[PDB]
Amino acid sequence: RECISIHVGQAGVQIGNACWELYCLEHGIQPDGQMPSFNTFFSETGAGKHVPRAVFVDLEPTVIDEVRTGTYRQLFHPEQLITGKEDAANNYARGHYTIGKEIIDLVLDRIRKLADQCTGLQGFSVFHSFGGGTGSGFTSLLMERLSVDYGKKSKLEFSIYPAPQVSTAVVEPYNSILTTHTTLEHSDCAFMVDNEAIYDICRRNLDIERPTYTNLNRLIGQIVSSITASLRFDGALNVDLTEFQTNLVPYPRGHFPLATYAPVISAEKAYHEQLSVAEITNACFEPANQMVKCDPRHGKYMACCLLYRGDVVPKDVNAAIATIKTKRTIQFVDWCPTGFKVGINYEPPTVVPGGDLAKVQRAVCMLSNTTAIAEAWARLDHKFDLMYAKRAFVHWYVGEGMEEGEFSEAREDMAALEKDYEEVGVDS
Amino acid sequence: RECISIHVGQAGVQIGNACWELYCLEHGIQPDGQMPSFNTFFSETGAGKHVPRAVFVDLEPTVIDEVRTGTYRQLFHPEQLITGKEDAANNYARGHYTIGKEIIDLVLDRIRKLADQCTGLQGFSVFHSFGGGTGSGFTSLLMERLSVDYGKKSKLEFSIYPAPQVSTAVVEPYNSILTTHTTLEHSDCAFMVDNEAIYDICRRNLDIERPTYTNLNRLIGQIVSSITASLRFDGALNVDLTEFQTNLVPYPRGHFPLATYAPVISAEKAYHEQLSVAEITNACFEPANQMVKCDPRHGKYMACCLLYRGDVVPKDVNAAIATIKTKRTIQFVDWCPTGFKVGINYEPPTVVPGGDLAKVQRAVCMLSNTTAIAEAWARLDHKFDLMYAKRAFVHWYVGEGMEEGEFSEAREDMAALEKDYEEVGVDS
Amino acid sequence: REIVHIQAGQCGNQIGAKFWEVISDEHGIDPTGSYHGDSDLQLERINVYYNEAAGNKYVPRAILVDLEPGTMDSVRSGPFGQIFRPDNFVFGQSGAGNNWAKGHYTEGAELVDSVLDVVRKESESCDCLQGFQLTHSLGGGTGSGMGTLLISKIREEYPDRIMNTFSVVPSPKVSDTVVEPYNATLSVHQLVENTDETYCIDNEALYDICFRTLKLTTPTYGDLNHLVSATMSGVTTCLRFPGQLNADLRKLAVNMVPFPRLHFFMPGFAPLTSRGSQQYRALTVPELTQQMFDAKNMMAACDPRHGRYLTVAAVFRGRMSMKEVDEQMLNVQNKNSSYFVEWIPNNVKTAVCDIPPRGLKMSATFIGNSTAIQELFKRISEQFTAMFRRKAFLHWYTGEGMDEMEFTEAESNMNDLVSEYQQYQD
Amino acid sequence: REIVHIQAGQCGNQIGAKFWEVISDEHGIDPTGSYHGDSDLQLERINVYYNEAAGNKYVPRAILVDLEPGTMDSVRSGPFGQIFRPDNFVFGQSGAGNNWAKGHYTEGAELVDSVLDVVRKESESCDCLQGFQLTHSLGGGTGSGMGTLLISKIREEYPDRIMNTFSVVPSPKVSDTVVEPYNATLSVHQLVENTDETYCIDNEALYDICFRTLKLTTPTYGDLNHLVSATMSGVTTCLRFPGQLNADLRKLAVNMVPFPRLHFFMPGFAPLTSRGSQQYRALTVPELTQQMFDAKNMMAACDPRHGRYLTVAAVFRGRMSMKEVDEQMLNVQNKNSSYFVEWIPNNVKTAVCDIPPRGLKMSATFIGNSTAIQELFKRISEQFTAMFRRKAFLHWYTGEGMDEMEFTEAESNMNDLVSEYQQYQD
């Protein structure tokens, strides 16, 4: 019943920092590993120290060093903290090939070591970003190997969705297009969120006009914990990760369920307001709490999964579902009946001490696969196209051995993906 | 069994301030929402805090800020307090169109959120003023949307009637004429009062020669509470808001029942004097307590509703009615028999601590639809005409996209309205 | 929500010196720049005129413009010259010399580009501008000349913002420049159609008030510009602070302008009497209305009862009843019905603010738009014609390239405003 | 992971004198060589620029090169000249005299072998080089002449390391050497294809900034080279220190070069204003972005809005939100869309470091690659042609064997860069 977390790149690792901090908060784990009390994620020592079963990869020493100098440096095993010396430079060509390919063997052997520590490997999940060099480059490299060795294990990916308006990486389209090509075909499911959309959540629901990544990742951590800690904890409907895959992936392509999370409420907003299960789920179908800037009303739904924490009675859930099925404007694709996975954990929602979110007594996470995602690809299509037509920055990949045909090909694979969304949109 | 209050503009909000203060006084609600004890208006939290189901709209931060810095800032939910940055400038053209139309979507979504919080929305009422930019401009904009979404719910409006002698808004005729055009057709019933008439009440019955709006709105609040708090409280004849509409609106045009309220008595005037139900109702048919400067003896009655608080015995009421039907000079229109709605609540009348009105043991509110209202329109007709003939101030509307034909049209709609009053006056 | 102010000309710079002083008084801001007040409101709406710079420093949102460093220096040398940042001092070197052509047409024109750049920088610093205000003299070279040029460009950049200006109007008795009516004529030609509204201040009238009701025998321009700033500050504070009525500048503009071209105002102010009588005065709304209506308390050398009143705004500061205000305004309308224009029913409009000016219990600002204003235009136009025929000092102006036909059109335009006042005088 | 820096020419040696000073400031390293800081980070990534010698001595990984001992001596005589080891002073005897031919082609060529040997010794001392940086003048004899020669050999030895250089570009007004455009032309001919990237610094622009925004009336080259070092140090510290974004120099190079030949940069810097205004400034991300975009805060005498922007890098130092940065950069892209090239979607890229420069809360470095750069090349090429036809001072150069056809090709190559900027200017 075990799983592995993999943190690649800054985004992967810094999100991971929040994630493991939250898992410590879930059980009262001390920075040194001492836990007085979740062995699905952790491995126990004779001292009662538990080791989070995870791998941290950075090709630049700095971020891992940040871990190594922080409080959780005692928690993590030195072998889990893997670092190279040089970067990918925002560039798949080095991340996947030239540079990252050198260290990956080590990385894999640490993974395999942990796989041998697992007794019942259920699977794993990889945290990264769609635009970066290691964030997406190295990441896909890893998938190429992991899908061989662990072909039957859960291969869930979580990635930051490139913001349409702000991006620090000029060749991000190129990176992301190459990842599509290589991740679609290897991964089982990839989830993503938009930091821009999140900012809007922070300013509207948390009332914060100063979000940093350390805020943004707390919110992400909430979502992740709902599906990682609480799915291993007790509930009414205990849903596994493999079950998630078995209930969220409808086609052999990928699919890309997007996250939505409600409650996201400031402490003051929690006052004077009573949420019910149904009210929280109402919020879950509002564009306003959509974690990716993509309009839910534009597309049609294919999948939807609702996962519940704390004070949730199935009775209320059932009523809530009835209304979301019938009251809303949620259009859905023919193919699908509304079999929405309901996970119901008794495990209460948790809050980070010193965080922004209010203590809540119940909480709902929503995953959804909508046809509007093709518009996200359309965004990438043109951004890629523009660059590629001019061949701007192309020498930074070509010099590492990339082929122009390959890039065209990858775009075409994306186009095919868009076409399949088109297909799904056609009802039948 | 729920309802929504909407406060638009200063007039709407400052009156609302008095209204919600009175509701707090009705139940002992603390500024923080803590109530130790009316859930038709309020929504309950797990802390026992109740939130007044209302929306506050101001396009200028200041008045809402006044709320936000006062004691009731803890009572109101931050989302209920909606503010823009700029004003309508006394001008429908910006209030309804150019400016207010930008924020209204937010406003509506907060309304809809509350509508979803309602379980049995009975309806709502809107507080504003006939002359202002947001007071009437924005207001009608709102009605345009609310009448779609909530077509079957109560749409009661309350507005300040432009004083014939004092007005601070030079284009008030123009504003009010445009509202007629758009409110007549959308709203169900609009009530109004004249601050000048009220001043006369304050100086003659309360003996106060220094009324401010904070006095004037207390008196308005009294009237409103009689029809809002006490209609949800227990009585002999428990009358609902929908019932009010069903008992006050005779035609599909609008109608405009005017308020009259007796008792309005200073503490010293209460001494040495014993009011009965009948005596209070005698006062209700006196011009002297008419809240709008319009002569009750001039027109003919069409509707009349009497709502009773405290120590009222139907027995006495019946006798009182007999005498008002037969003793008075109240002429009434043929169409109507004297079916005057009697609401009889056991709920006692309440008084604002530190207010001007005396503690009374019983109280009567009167609503009435008289043909004399056409004279009020006549006032507007000429005021509008004068300006419009010269085309004074016209550029302040034209520059926002208003049409001259439209203004003519709106006047004509008013003329038609006057003609319908003429019609009703003709007995048949 | 915010306002930018630009001062120009020796007049404008010295008026602004008092204006900003007062604004900081209103908010408890020290001559050195920091906030040391004591009321919530004092900081609450400070944004309209100040940028808070790091360290709790407030920067007045205004540009000081001149073509002689020495005037600027004298401004800078006093208290509140330190609150302005160096970047708000935009100036050249060599005067204008009270020459429109230099100011507008040629040399001053050169500086305007640097001024405007700073304007742009400030427009970005604001969240949302309500408008702009400029202070200047109508018969001056930089005051009107260069100032006008600037206005035409600002309006171009921001059609949707309020453009108003207060300006010193050549008094019948004290003109300084021989061609002061010429400069004024040219400014009408340019300003009227490039502004939303302009205020008419007559120094002669001001000197009469200061002795007539205030009984003072020593004023200087700083004392008279205090009175000017009282009216300017009166207008914007309400917009800033909580009140009862309708406190928006644009709405004021809407209520005061019945016709696209006739936007000239006569400011007045109450209470405004000597200390001796202060022991014999009563403070009521009728008291303020008596002072407001009285032509002698106008700051413009006009006579509203000679002309007809198109629009009247009565702005009140401090706690007053609504009733009393309504009734007294009605009474005014009633008793002075012979001066009001019949086309506008209830031509007297009000605005009410609950914050009194520091040191007073109550106060009121009178703003009027009468037809009487045309008399000032008539005086100027006439004087202009005489000079026009002789070309007095026009070699200076034509020497800098100003063409006489442009001046001819300017003359017409003055006459047009008069004829339009006649068209609505009836 | 490490960088080697080589300074050459009187310019380069004096710039480096400030550069290294700053780097040691950043890490708390004393002028005598030992570490006396106080932050973990200060030692943590020190490796990129220092070798720790026995005794907790830090040796700057750089070579000081000249052909006159006296300049070297003056460098050595100040603080931080003691931190450099004697072995890093490589120099000859007898100038170059600002003669490319001497520097590159003949005499200076002789010294280069000893320089390179030391370079090799340092390349071995490093664990893993990221790259090399050189500081020099484009129109100088050793700065460009000898320096270029060195670059061609270093690149040869290390194709896989970053080769960049910062160089003083002949300002339109102050050329010292009559054939300064000639030397520059020759350096383009050699450098452009033998470097990964080069930065364009104009002293004239720098002198304008120091008075324009910094309002200073006494700068020297040390004060202007401080500004230069601010940009240089800005770049590498992020690479050194923990941040948020992507802090690798090579990645910067990748994001800023769309085409193999067009790698010229316009550095700029924020915040960068006088102390007076510092009391009136607010420190926000938009504030930095306003200073970064503004052409007057560029250190290159170009005008980015004249040309088109190919790439923009915005590097931030200190704690900022990601949101705010993202939004403001987007806004920039949006509002200045008329200058950006349409082929590159979202042409503004960012990098974020969480360590502020000592003494400031925040700072930002502007790096741009516009087409406007071509204007500098055009000025030089033109001036060159005139001289070329006359052979001014070319007897000195041809006397040392430099052939005119090589110069002819150099001229073409300049023109080629301009035509390629035109090819992507569109």
Ligand SMILES: Nc1nc2c(ncn2[C@@H]2O[C@H](COP(=O)(O)CP(=O)(O)OP(=O)(O)O)[C@@H](O)[C@H]2O)c(=O)[nH]1
């Ligand atoms: N109420 C006031 N009027 C003033 C003041 N200073 C000047 N003026 C009036 O303004 C006009 C003369 O103008 P200025 O000093 O403003 C001329 P300015 O410096 O704008 O331009 P130049 O031609 O470049 O000198 C004139 O009607 C003076 O009589 C003042 O301080 N207060």
Ligand SMILES: Nc1nc2c(ncn2[C@@H]2O[C@H](COP(=O)(O)CP(=O)(O)OP(=O)(O)O)[C@@H](O)[C@H]2O)c(=O)[nH]1
């Ligand atoms: N921003 C700066 N530019 C400088 C400085 N010193 C010189 N220069 C500029 O550099 C060029 C002149 O060059 P140098 O002193 O570097 C010549 P160098 O000593 O490399 O070689 P020689 O020909 O052997 O003298 C020119 O554009 C000067 O104007 C400086 O300290 N700062």
Ligand SMILES: Nc1nc2c(ncn2[C@@H]2O[C@H](COP(=O)(O)OP(=O)(O)OP(=O)(O)O)[C@@H](O)[C@H]2O)c(=O)[nH]1
């Ligand atoms: N939510 C979130 N997004 C982040 C975080 N850090 C970076 N990102 C986003 O991820 C992308 C940045 O990737 P980089 O940091 O440049 O690169 P990397 O993927 O770590 O790998 P390299 O390019 O080789 O350094 C941008 O789109 C950022 O907005 C973080 O802590 N949280």
Ligand SMILES: Nc1nc2c(ncn2[C@@H]2O[C@H](COP(=O)(O)OP(=O)(O)OP(=O)(O)O)[C@@H](O)[C@H]2O)c(=O)[nH]1
């Ligand atoms: N009874 C009562 N009447 C009020 C109050 N405030 C204002 N009024 C009246 O309502 C009208 C004023 O509207 P304004 O305050 O100018 O404007 P608004 O309707 O709030 O909206 P804007 O014009 O955009 O500011 C006048 O006729 C006033 O006499 C109040 O508190 N109570």
Ligand SMILES: [Mg+2]
């Ligand atoms: Mg990284």
Ligand SMILES: [Mg+2]
């Ligand atoms: Mg208002």
Ligand SMILES: [Mg+2]
């Ligand atoms: Mg002057």
Ligand SMILES: [Mg+2]
């Ligand atoms: Mg030298």
